[PDB]
Amino acid sequence: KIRNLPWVEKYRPQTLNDLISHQDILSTIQKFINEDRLPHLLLYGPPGTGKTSTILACAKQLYKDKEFGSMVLELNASDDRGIDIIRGPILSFASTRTIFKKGFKLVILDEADAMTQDAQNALRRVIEKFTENTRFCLICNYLSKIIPALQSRCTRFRFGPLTPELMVPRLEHVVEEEKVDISEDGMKALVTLSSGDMRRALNILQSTNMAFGKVTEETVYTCTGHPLKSDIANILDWMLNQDFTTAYRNITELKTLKGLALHDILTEIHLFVHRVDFPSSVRIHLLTKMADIEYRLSVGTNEKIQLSSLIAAFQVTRDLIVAEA
Amino acid sequence: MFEARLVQGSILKKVLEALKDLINEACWDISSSGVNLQSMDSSHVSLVQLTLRSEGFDTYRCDRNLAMGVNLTSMSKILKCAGNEDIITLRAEDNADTLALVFEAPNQEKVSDYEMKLMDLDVEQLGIPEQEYSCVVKMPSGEFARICRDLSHIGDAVVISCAKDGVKFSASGELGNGNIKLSQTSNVDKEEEAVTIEMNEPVQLTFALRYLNFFTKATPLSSTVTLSMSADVPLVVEYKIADMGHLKYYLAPKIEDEEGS
Amino acid sequence: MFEARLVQGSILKKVLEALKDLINEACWDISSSGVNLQSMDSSHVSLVQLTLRSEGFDTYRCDRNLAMGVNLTSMSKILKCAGNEDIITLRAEDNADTLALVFEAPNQEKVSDYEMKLMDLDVEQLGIPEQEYSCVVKMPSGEFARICRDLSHIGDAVVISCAKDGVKFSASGELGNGNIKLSQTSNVDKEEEAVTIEMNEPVQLTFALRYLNFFTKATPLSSTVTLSMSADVPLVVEYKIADMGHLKYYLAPKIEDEEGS
Amino acid sequence: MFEARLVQGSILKKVLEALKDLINEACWDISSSGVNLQSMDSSHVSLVQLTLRSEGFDTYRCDRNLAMGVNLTSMSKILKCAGNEDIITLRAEDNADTLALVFEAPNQEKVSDYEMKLMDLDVEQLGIPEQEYSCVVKMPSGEFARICRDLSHIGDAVVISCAKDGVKFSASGELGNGNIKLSQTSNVDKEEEAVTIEMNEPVQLTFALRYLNFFTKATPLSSTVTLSMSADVPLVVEYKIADMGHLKYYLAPKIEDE
Amino acid sequence: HYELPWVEKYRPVKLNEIVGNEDTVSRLEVFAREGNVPNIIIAGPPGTGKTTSILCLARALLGPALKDAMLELNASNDRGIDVVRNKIKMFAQQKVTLPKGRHKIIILDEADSMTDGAQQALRRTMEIYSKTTRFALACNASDKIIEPIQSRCAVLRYTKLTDAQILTRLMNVIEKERVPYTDDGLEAIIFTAQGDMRQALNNLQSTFSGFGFINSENVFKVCDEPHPLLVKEMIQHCVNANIDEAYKILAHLWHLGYSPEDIIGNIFRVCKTFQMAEYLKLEFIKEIGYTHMKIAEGVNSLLQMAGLLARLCQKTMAP
Amino acid sequence: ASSHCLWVDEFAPRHYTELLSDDFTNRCLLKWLKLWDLVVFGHERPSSHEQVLEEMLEAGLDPSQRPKQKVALLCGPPGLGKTTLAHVIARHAGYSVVEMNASDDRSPEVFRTRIEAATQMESVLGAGGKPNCLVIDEIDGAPVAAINVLLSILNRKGLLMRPIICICNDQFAPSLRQLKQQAFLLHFPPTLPSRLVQRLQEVSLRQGMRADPGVLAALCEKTDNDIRACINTLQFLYSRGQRELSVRDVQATRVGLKDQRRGLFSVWQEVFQLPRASLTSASQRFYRVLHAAASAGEHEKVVQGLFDNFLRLRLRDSSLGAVCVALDWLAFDDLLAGAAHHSQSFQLLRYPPFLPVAFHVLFASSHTPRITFPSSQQEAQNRMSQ
DNA sequence: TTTTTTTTATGTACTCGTAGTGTCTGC
DNA sequence: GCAGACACTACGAGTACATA
């Protein structure tokens, strides 16, 4: 049947084989499940890489639908996870048996970086004393916000960013399930603008399919509003090759016609700077000035003056690069 | 269209008062047989099975089956201002989100229409095994409320044992131990106060006192309680309402470990 | 010089906490007919009238029309020091800025005297129009305090509808709509529960919950309460308190939504 | 092996309520003659000397001498669940860390076995408190607890003055002055209400009101109470029980006389 | 029955099975053999064996009387102000018959979580009932335990386990489990352990379950290289104003999925104990804090970290 | 029972002659407790900071034949013998020690009941009974209302007739401000290393253990003149496997090292003055100053002391560049505090511990500076509120 | 050889005092 | 049958701190 769902939730890897990237980690967790030797897991990485979906597929593989409510205790940041919850419901779930069928239980603590340090210190002996009865899975995006005791007690798997070569078949599966007309440059634009994020890949795909009806490079870069790489090359050429007035006029006309934002222009110019064989002092000056301009855009500032400063940071270094020779 | 009419208002108060700090939200399953409720607690340790029969209500009609998950703290505030000698009507439509509660005042002069917004939790059905038990004990509910209250003063976990002789309550605490052994109290004038042993195999298990004390707040529902115990299946605290249905309380045993020495 | 003497200590111990969180000051106006008090809330919503006639006092002396202003932050803490069934008197000199009240200490052995400074505030009498309201109804005192408490668990604003059948209290919130309909309670033994309707024109106005809860804190002073509603005149909560006078409340209605077709 | 079957649980409930907040421990010295409890306060204000004889129990077995240091808040939790008319079995082993109490309190054949962990304490030894009291009077237990409750409503300390006529109870404070004039009440039908006089050298001392209210918590434990006091020697009240034994309470006077 | 993981399955049950800190563990062996152990506080890094040493010492001292003469309290318990007054003091007053040289042991594991008032109430019960009871404390941050408690105990400090000390226990686990291995795979396990026996056992079990063999490629396919081991040379390149190699290390750490907060935390951790000039270190730390305020304010991109690296390179060239 | 007791309990002093504290403090406490013999025992005959204490012992008595200072307040670092001195001096003067410590309830009702039981009554034993001397340990952790109850029973004119001894570890607690103006303040100096070394030598000779004076002096300077910590360290280090203690076992950081709570003035001296002459490396002083300023606590008071004391030094930087970069560091700390308290991101508080080491690097001198307590910012805030 | 005080905006955790209230005792 | 006393839990209030 059809459901009114976002494509990040309509297409979720309910089984472990539907995930794409981390094949060694998923194979090791599958061999943990098959041997019934599942340890305390610590899944960390950037968002959108498949940490929640992995443990949900593992929980559905370990437990049946008639025993899932008494075997899995899933708590996240939307629930209260204070120290009275660690001493209360979590300890009573860990220290007791099951109801229907005998087996080890699972405590899923999603977004474990948001927990307080008192709760994390109270979690240590609950994990250690009841290893035979229950298992604890900790999910976080920041490993520095989890205490080193819980990092020692749980074996850590890094769910790194998804490579664009592996995000193509899952996007093709979503495309062929949703009847989406997409070209090759549309797929390249999706996997370039995602930057190791499967969630925003499906979000950009759904928004581009609804906005235009076809997914090409121009439709993706128009719906997202991201500048094209030819536009960034033209901006760099104007900033490095002519005077202040003509570069200001050309960059202002390009930003007015294309409807560009200075944040993405700064990001792509920062990526272009390290590719250009600059002198070291010129590179340091450009990085400091671009970081200052990027910091200035986080408040109620005028974007035209910051665009002029972005032009100025290269108009200063024109003479230094040329006189370096 | 679902329309259930409580003949008495005290039973709905006494059911909800037992489940107030235990059941997170009420899952009323409605069919032609009656009203069912199988919901776990917040800690996923206890399970509450409530079955209200259709013949217990004053008027009961049900066209299509419904599963109306609703909040219980919201249901607690509308049941405090409810009389104990008046009829309460449960109403809900086919494709609506309002659960209507119509009753009378303690002054018995005004209608009181209390709507509740239904919840959309997707809860999987828990499979009750319905197997036999190695111990079945009939017991007064007033005595079982007293003993679990008396052993909460000593410790926090009770090692309740049963055998052919009777049920035994033990609580090893900080002060010491409290051992209660009651057996064969059927030689009295009343009929509710009696200890009857049905099954054979002895079983010793340890349970939390916090959940057992929550189970004993259903004491005004039934004057006699039934305790079921076995070595694998959990402890069942079966209340049977006189003309309305029955209530079952499940509690998992705690993990205990022997000393290596 | 002003000198008045009450007949009971509970006629001031139960009315001051209703004005404790409602109004910030108690302005007493002294006249030959009696003592008047018309104070308005700082939010320009609530307005309380309290007049006690001179015949109900044990004794009353008034030669000049004097007005004194005192704060609720200091008279409330000395009210709990005073007794319940003791006698209370109030004394005020013509030229001094001190209000002295003499009563009995709660051990019933010694005279306890407290002094309060007179706050000089330049206020003016607003003046009630005393127009004929579109609704006149009679409700019990203790039952009406239980009405606004029940709608306090639902939403922050109540809806009052007074047609010819009775008075409907409604509150649509994030939990669900709570509707009651008090009507036709003339067949009771006690005369204070006689619910009756004295007008014909219906009206529907929404009011703030918090001040209506403040209005129900003066409920044990009288046996009944009189409610008056109109199209644009504020709601009147009238108490006929004991024998020495009557108490009157005013509450501005809430805004209405742009529900035009 | 130690066993002591108390014939009624009223004996034990009223003792441990009379010294619940008075002393923090119970030191039951066990001998063949009976059960002895001699405990003093840490601040040296009150002394409790309880003596229960072996003839007042249902059974009494004692192989070796025992000292059972017991917490009073731990054993006050037992009697709360004990019956007023019930046989209580207080038993312990010779060298054991635990003390057991067995009873059938609710009269519904509910065999209750309550055990407590003993506490080891330093042995503070006082041999015999001297008894050369000049003023010894007799008084009913109910009226003595009546005037201690009456005097507690006004002041915080009482002045007790023995005399040929009787004992005088007075207090002073900001509220008022509560004073009684005890006369000879021997012309009554009840033999417990009579005030017997066997005194000489009338004295006057000041005592704390809080510790006297704790001493008068044993009013139903005995019919009458014998008050013994003198100069530079603490006041003794005496609750002579019917068959189990006797119970006395010592109270040091305040430093500020009158 | 469910088999335990190798962290809990191969927990030592005797004090002679504990590797690392040989002098302190040997003295604990002597104290367990003879008796009359003083109050101890064992401090150190996680996974060193403090709780294992305390529990093995309690098991060797008590033995069959471990159930009645030991009180183990964790951070999962209450242990508030009213637990020290009414449960710890009552257990210290409790009469337990023990052999000569043996006392009751009150184990207060993870004593960092205990409040200041509870530790103040813990002092006199430590001092009065010391003839019959003893205290065994374990902690990570020993400064959270107050000075009067540390004066009342023999403060033991555990250091990080070396490569050979972890390697001996790993060889014992391998010979118990018949795990095939190579030398460089065990060196990779040691390198990923970083002085932690728990992480060594977890990585060994993960590599054995996922691949069935221990070489360097199977270890590094599931486990990871430690973070500050490359941040150290990133800071070294920032000292010599080499912005290109520092950005290469920064981009390599960025493409592995590390958040900017973790990267700047490792940068501050390296710069806190780096071997350079003191004034240069202070202005480096001030620049790190200035960038960390921007990261916590909401702006956190690769351009901000590159600007931080460029500012750290400038601070060298601006004496 | 040599194998049943701790070595601190076995070698604890039971007489006056074997105390290890400073003799001046013991004599002052004994003379203060012997001034109560007029009103307690009913006998006429009992048988700088020093000048004020000698004046307090000879200033006479009040008209109610009692000393004008009815509380002896004992303050100092832990492990010196304050509780030992109080108990030995109370048992020496014929009193019975009534102990009130931090494991009691410490609520004002229980505090009032305990003091009224300990001080307002006689003894049960009558003639020959020991008087009760109330010793209140850990009075620094008591609540302010308990101190108000103690002062109310101190100055009630229900008259006090028995001495009260109060023992604290920090005299500058906010709850003991009004207690200091009324009590007989006895500040405990650190113990003499020669006497402590002789006592440790006697303890080791009693246990059959051999140790040089040098290794015992190393232990004494390691434990910061703590008697209890030194005896516990010897009890752990000796055991029975070996007899001769080595220098390297004490010099090792594995046994005997405890985290000291450094005072504010010691931290300010350590920051503003270089150590006197290995330890001459700048990185060792950097880490020592950082760890000491972290271990002190009360970081805002340290920052206020640095702000109020760095301009009164004999500064060699006449170009005011060091002052400018120190004020930049202070503004950096202020911005870090504001950003951590604004965005709920408290991982920005690991940097302001480097403010005292920045002040140590900038203003290191070999002179002897006079450090005063910071008061300018608090007086400015009080005047601004007024 | 030198010590007083309240500001940062939430969120959590701890601790302590207070007030309706269910239940027991008694005339 | 109704007034007084006992402890019970929920709730209001004050305070500290949050890094390595």
Ligand SMILES: Nc1ncnc2c1ncn2[C@@H]1O[C@H](COP(=O)(O)OP(=O)(O)OP(O)(O)=S)[C@@H](O)[C@H]1O
């Ligand atoms: N490896 C993956 N394979 C396939 N789809 C994926 C993968 N990772 C993410 N997705 C998609 O993205 C959605 C969200 O994935 P999540 O598991 O929630 O990512 P996540 O790792 O949990 O990120 P955070 O840290 O929780 S915000 C899924 O429902 C899928 O549609």
Ligand SMILES: Nc1ncnc2c1ncn2[C@@H]1O[C@H](COP(=O)(O)OP(=O)(O)OP(O)(O)=S)[C@@H](O)[C@H]1O
């Ligand atoms: N020194 C050691 N020798 C042998 N195994 C060890 C050692 N240290 C740790 N282990 C193993 O790691 C497990 C955990 O050790 P623990 O002692 O619980 O850690 P810990 O020292 O308490 O550190 P924290 O601060 O509590 S996380 C043990 O069960 C052993 O399997």
Ligand SMILES: Nc1ncnc2c1ncn2[C@@H]1O[C@H](COP(=O)(O)OP(=O)(O)OP(O)(O)=S)[C@@H](O)[C@H]1O
């Ligand atoms: N002369 C002595 N010889 C040997 N041990 C001693 C001597 N004097 C004291 N001690 C011991 O050293 C310790 C002194 O600490 P205490 O007096 O009990 O407390 P304190 O010194 O006031 O320090 P705090 O603040 O309470 S931790 C005790 O364990 C004494 O038994």
Ligand SMILES: [Mg+2]
């Ligand atoms: Mg997630």
Ligand SMILES: [Mg+2]
């Ligand atoms: Mg541990």
Ligand SMILES: [Mg+2]
């Ligand atoms: Mg001490």
